[PDB]
Structure 1
Amino acid sequence: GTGVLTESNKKFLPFQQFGRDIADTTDAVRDPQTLEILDITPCSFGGVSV
């Protein structure tokens, strides 16, 4: 995926890995190597009007 990985304040349960929003799209990930939760936010984008 392409996104920004940030610190999270979401209290994940030990079994829980992925995280999802109301759109059932990946919003957080738990890394196997280091057991920490990285919030995933899509990178900034927008329409350009001239």
Structure 2
Amino acid sequence: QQFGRDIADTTDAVRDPQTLEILDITPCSFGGVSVITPGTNTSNQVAVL
């Protein structure tokens, strides 16, 4: 083996060249940006989720 595959066509692990070492690949974190506001009738302060 050289690289492991997911159920999609993306990688999941890889054999590192120049050292023959095995490394796990997970994607770094993401998410939507949700903004909590009381409305502009009261205040312009917001909280970001």
TM-score, structure 2 as length reference: 0.64
Is 1:32 the counterpart of 2:34? The answer is no
CA offsets 1:7-49 (integer angstroms, 9 cap, x no match)? xxxxxxxxx0011111121111101111111010110000010
Figure out how many residues of one structure are paired with residues of the other and give that number: 35
Aligned residue type for 1:39: D
Provide runs of 4+ in structure 1 moved above 6 Å.
none
- RMSD over aligned CA atoms reads 0.8
Q: Percent identity?
A: 100
Gaps of 5+ in 1: 1-15
Cα distance in 1 for residues equivalent to 2:17 and 2:23: 12
Higher-Rg member (1/2): 2
Gaps of 5+ in 2: 36-49
Higher RCO (Cα < 8 Å, 6 or more apart): 1
